């Protein structure tokens, strides 16, 4: 299959969901704090209006997928392998489902952009964002932007 997406699936086991977009997984037999590619999850911000504290929601959704997954896989992109603090920046599958998408598809994330290179599914995340926007999901239930949502 000829594709722009010439990446590589790799195994990970859930150790500890750190954030909505940061997760310690076992990779190659060692714990590493992974980073959800193309994902922008909110921290525990304001409990009123705007970009609310949709952090536990995001984190627990990520956590959900990763704890629920018996198989977590990752796929390192062509940009970078490490983000934030050198977290492991990669595509992430949880029981085969894409965490990144699912987080931004849930309305617990926005489409980010990490590094020039790793954005091979950014289209999908922006689409999932916009999907969550159009349906108005979690963050998108807020008037934080209202310029696409």
Would you list the DSSP string of 83-141? ETTTEEEEEEEETTEEHHHHHHHHTS-EE---BTTB-TTHHHHHHHHHHHHHHT-GGGG
Domain with 58 in it: 1-149
CA distances from 147 to 44, 91, 140, 143 (A): 23, 28, 11, 9
Handedness of CA 51, 39, 87, 65 (dihedral sign): positive
Half-sphere exposure of 29 (CA within 13 A, CB side): 0
In the annotation, is 35 catalytic?
Answer: yes
- Count structural domains, the chain: 1
CATH of the domain at 67: 2.40.50.90
In the annotation, is 105 catalytic?
Answer: no
Q: How was this structure determined?
A: NMR
Which of 135, 57, 136, 142 lies closest to 103, judged by CA?
Answer: 57
**33 in a labelled binding site:** no
| Cα distance between residue 81 and residue 94, in whole Å | 18
**40 in a labelled binding site:** yes
């Amino acid at each position: 299959a000829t594709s722009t997406k010439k990446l590589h699936k790799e195994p990970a086991t859930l150790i500890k969901a750190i954030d909505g977009d940061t997760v310690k997984l076992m990779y190659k037999g060692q714990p590493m704090t992974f980073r959800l590619l193309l994902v922008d999850t909110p921290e525990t911000k304001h409990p009123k209006k705007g970009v609310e504290k949709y952090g536990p929601e995001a984190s627990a959704f990520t956590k959900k997928m990763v704890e629920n997954a018996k198989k977590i896989e990752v796929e390192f992109d062509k940009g970078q392998r490490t983000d934030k603090y050198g977290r492991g920046l990669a595509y992430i599958y949880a029981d085969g489902k894409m965490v990144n998408e699912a987080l931004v598809r849930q309305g617990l994330a926005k489409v980010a952009y990490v590094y020039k290179g790793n954005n091979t599914h950014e289209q999908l995340l922006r689409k999932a964002e916009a999907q969550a926007k159009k349906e108005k999901l979690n963050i998108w239930s807020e008037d934080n932007a209202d310029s696409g949502q």
